[PDB]
Design a protein around this ligand. Sequence first.
Ligand SMILES: Nc1ncnc2c1ncn2[C@@H]1O[C@H](COP(=O)(O)OP(=O)(O)OP(=O)(O)O)[C@@H](O)[C@H]1O
Ligand SMILES: [Mg+2]
Length: 120
Amino acid sequence: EWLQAEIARLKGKSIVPLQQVKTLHDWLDGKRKARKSCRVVGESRTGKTVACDAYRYRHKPQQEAGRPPTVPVVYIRPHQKCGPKDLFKKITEYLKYRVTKGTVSDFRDRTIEVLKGCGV
DNA sequence: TGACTGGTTGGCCACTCAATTTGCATCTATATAGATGCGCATCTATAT
Ligand SMILES: Nc1ncnc2c1ncn2[C@@H]1O[C@H](COP(=O)(O)OP(=O)(O)OP(=O)(O)O)[C@@H](O)[C@H]1O
Ligand SMILES: [Mg+2]
């Protein structure tokens, strides 16, 4: 009946535009055009991760039949005590590059090489 | 006639994690010797 779907809208997650989200998207675009690194800080329930999701979605990948894709924005949440091989594995996986095994020095070189040409 | 011979169905390196030692900084809750102040005795002086 009608009552059963309604848990799902409620339980279901959604994104609501808010002033705080808009503020970040414009600031990040300044940083992205300028190629300036920066940090975002704030308390854990302010919804930082969600604003960053909403930002990622506004810039879809472009894919041709043969050559590899353009992807402007990469988002990763490291695991606790994330080491070098674990960081390179996450950058590599968010792009779905097929190679999965390697020495730390091999993943380092391979990560630099997939950020290049892919146009991040 | 009793001999001879032939017959024949894991290793070499690079990286990571639980641990467990050692050292340092920060309470903390008690233990312990010195000022300070009444509370009365004791002496001295003064007056009728
Ligand atoms: N723009 C938004 N629209 C709708 N809901 C939002 C928005 N921003 C945050 N929320 C709500 O915040 C909750 C999740 O918080 P979120 O994970 O965004 O916080 P956070 O600050 O990124 O957390 P942390 O820093 O601890 O990782 C959800 O209930 C989600 O609906
Ligand atoms: Mg977050």
